[PDB]
Amino acid sequence: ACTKNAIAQTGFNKDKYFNGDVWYVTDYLDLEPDDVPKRYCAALAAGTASGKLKEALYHYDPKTQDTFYDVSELQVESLGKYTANFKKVDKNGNVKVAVTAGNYYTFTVMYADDSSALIHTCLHKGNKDLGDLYAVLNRNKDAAAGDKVKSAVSAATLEFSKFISTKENNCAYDNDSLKSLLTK
Numbered sequence: 001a002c003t004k005n006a007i008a009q010t011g012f013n014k015d016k017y018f019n020g021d022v023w024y025v026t027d028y029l030d031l032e033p034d035d036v037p038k039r040y041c042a043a044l045a046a047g048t049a050s051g052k053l054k055e056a057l058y059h060y061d062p063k064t065q066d067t068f069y070d071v072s073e074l075q076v077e078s079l080g081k082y083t084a085n086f087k088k089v090d091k092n093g094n095v096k097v098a099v100t101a102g103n104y105y106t107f108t109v110m111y112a113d114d115s116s117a118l119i120h121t122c123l124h125k126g127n128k129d130l131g132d133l134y135a136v137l138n139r140n141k142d143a144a145a146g147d148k149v150k151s152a153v154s155a156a157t158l159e160f161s162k163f164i165s166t167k168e169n170n171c172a173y174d175n176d177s178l179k180s181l182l183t184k
């Protein structure tokens, strides 16, 4: 299970974060891991679409080739803190698994600027036992974590050297699908 109440960034700028553009996960910290996809690719788009706050997700295991997209309408808990009931979709937004209660992640933006961010997420999916996951994001998929975001990792009482990089995995992303999924 999840154990963290992550604190949102002071003065979080929601319209800048949710500007409809793409964010790439460059490094992550799973608190509840194992033999799991040690190598992983993930990215999201976040924006307001016809007045609704939205996130589109992409996951790719470059070793198994397991691929999936999700789209959610976010609900606000407080500034920088959201609950997302997700639906699994194909890249075009056609529903594969409909929204259901019990399938949701929370999402806290702990730090963000115009190029980088640190988020916490707690995933819930049916009867499964899942733990916290932190992720370092960047607008550039190949960007090394800079001092702003690494300092924020430290400020969250975490150690960046423990985070796992995705940069070795040779991830390629469909940015266009992620942006268009925001409307679906």
Ligand code: HEM
Binding pocket: 025, 028, 030, 036, 037, 040, 041, 042, 044, 057, 059, 068, 069, 070, 086, 087, 088, 097, 104, 105, 119, 121, 123, 125, 128, 133, 135
């Ligand atoms: C912004 C970051 C992330 C968020 C919001 C996110 C959220 C989610 C959601 C919503 C699901 C379930 C999707 C579905 O069943 O339709 C999922 C599944 C999963 N995610 Fe992520 N994820 C993120 C990052 C990552 C990272 C970096 C990895 C690698 C450690 C990871 C590995 C997986 C795994 C292996 C699954 C399959 C879970 C299962 O069904 O047991 N995710 N994630």
Ligand SMILES: NCCc1c[nH]cn1
Binding pocket: 030, 031, 032, 033, 121, 122, 123, 130, 131, 132, 133
């Ligand atoms: N224990 C990490 C579960 C996960 C996958 N995606 C988001 N969270």
